[PDB]
Amino acid sequence: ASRLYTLVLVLQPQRVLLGMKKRGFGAGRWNGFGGKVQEGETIEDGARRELQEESGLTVDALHKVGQIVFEFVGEPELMDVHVFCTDSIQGTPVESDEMRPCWFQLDQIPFKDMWPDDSYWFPLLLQKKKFHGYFKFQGQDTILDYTLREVDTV
């Protein structure tokens, strides 16, 4: 029982793009861009679609950097999150109903206003290492269990 999601990180030499989630699940946290993958689109299609919906940005190339599985206690579907990075973007990011985008210096990541699991796996993304992760949550604050490792193939 799993469902595909995407997560897109615009990572440039000295800054990373994040959006403050305005509504929905996990609102009030700085997030990457992404969401559910729809029927009839590839995972990467879905990633590019969510990026454009949430920020207006398009990209020449997205690169697979990771995969994270989330379990929430009592919820039947696991989240199968495919994580992507890009450096070159096309456009200037703008606010959507869902996300307010801002750039952050790579030593000023707002981990305290981000999902707790970000503190574990995001530095690996910043270090340009591919990774597989698993995080078990009870609610949105408490990691009950996790595994994390670098991988050669995402």
Ligand X SMILES: NNC(=O)c1cnc2ccc(F)cc2c1N
Binding-site residue ranges for 2-oxo-dATP: 6, 31, 33-36, 115-118
> Should residue 70 be labelled a site residue for ligand X when binding is judged by CB under 6 A?
yes
Annotated binding site: 6, 21, 25, 31, 33-36, 50, 53-54, 98, 115-118
What is the C-alpha to C-alpha distance for residues 140 and 143, in angstroms, rounded to an integer? 8
Q: What DSSP designation does 52 have?
A: H
Rounded Cα distance, 154 and 150, in Å: 9
Distance CA 139, CA 143 (A): 9
Binding residues for 8-oxo-dGTP: 6, 21, 31, 33-36, 115-118
DSSP bridge partners of 142: 138
Q: Pick from 26, 28, 91, 110 the residue near ligand X by CB under 6 A.
A: 26
Site string for ligand X, 4-23 (x = CB under 6 A): ---x----------------
Q: For residue 54, state whether it binds ligand X (rule: CB under 6 A).
A: no
C-beta separation of 118 from 140 below 8 A: no
The separation between CA 102 and the C-alpha centre of its own chain, rounded to angstroms, equals: 15
Rule CB under 6 A: which of 72-131 touch ligand X? 79, 115, 117-118
Which positions touch ligand X (CB under 6 A)? 7, 26, 31-32, 70, 79, 115, 117-118
